[PDB]
């Protein structure tokens, strides 16, 4: 088989920009010039970029831009002027000629510290919670990152100043998120963990700031 890996998932405020990345490896020649795809929970799979000359949907035309690098097996997507319809898990390409883990991207519609962590089997019913300077109106766009030592940042869940929730395909159905309106903290369920999930977890992403980071392991 051929392997695809997406990376670059961010939670951003509207009008912001991103670069998605997709690194490939497989059994055939070093360059295959092909595209990008996405999915939001209220939507099916959708083409984002690709093909013999490049193509973009009307919904992203002029905003998203594909590019490629040949020395390092990476294909990219500049994404300018992000919008709350662009909150989606972005996927790279058909496996051969009809498949990656999926990278969550979220766009928000409107002294850091975390708690929880530990060691688990066979997984579920945890109380990770993120908690800093709770009282004074600090309630901002938020989500939980995770990182294992080799591979890069992966966004798994998101919340914001409103109770609206979205997840990564890596965790969909298994993770779950909520926020307390009096304690002003956000919680992560972490149901039915799998060894692939062992990572240190972080709570924040962008400027007005990093988390403490807390390790979850599941060894059994």
Author numbering: 1 to 51, 55 to 101, 107 to 118, 130 to 227, 231 to 242
Which sentences from the paper describe this structure?
Out of the IL-18 SCAs evaluated, DR3097 exhibited the largest VHH–VHH interface with a BSA of 1402 Å2. The VHHs are positioned side-to-side against each other and engage in a large interaction network comprising hydrogen bonds and various hydrophobic residues in the center of the interface. To enforce the dimerized conformation across the VHH–VHH interface, seven pairs of cysteine mutations (S1 to S7) were designed using the Rosetta protein design program to determine structurally compatible disulfide bond positions in the DR3097 SCA. LCMS analysis showed that all stapled SCAs except for S2 formed a disulfide bond with no detectable traces of the reduced form, suggesting that the dimeric conformation could be sampled in solution and might not be just a feature of crystal packing. We observed an increase in melting temperature (Tm) for all six SCAs that formed a disulfide bond over DR3097 and the S2 non-disulfide-bonded SCA. The highest thermostability improvement over DR3097 (Tm = 61 °C) was a 16 °C shift measured for S4 (Tm = 77 °C), followed by 13 °C, 12 °C, 7 °C, 6 °C, and 3 °C shifts measured for S6, S7, S1, S5, and S3, respectively. Yet, in the case of the IL-18 SCA DR3097, the dimeric interaction has enough temporal stability in solution to ensure stoichiometric formation of the engineered disulfide bonds, as we have shown for the six DR3097 engineered disulfide pairs. While others have shown that conformation stapling can lead to increased agonism in canonical antibodies, here we are not able to achieve an increase in activity beyond conferring an increase in thermostability of up to 16 °C. This is likely driven by a reduction in affinity to IL-18Rβ, due to the corresponding VHH CDR being proximal to the dimer interface.
All four SCAs crystallized in a dimeric conformation where the two linked VHHs interact to form unique antiparallel VHH–VHH interfaces with their complementary determining regions (CDRs) pointing in opposing directions in all structures. Interestingly, comparison of the four structures by overlaying the N-terminal VHH shows that, while the C-terminal VHHs of each SCA cluster on the same face of the N-terminal VHH, they adopt four different inter-VHH interactions.
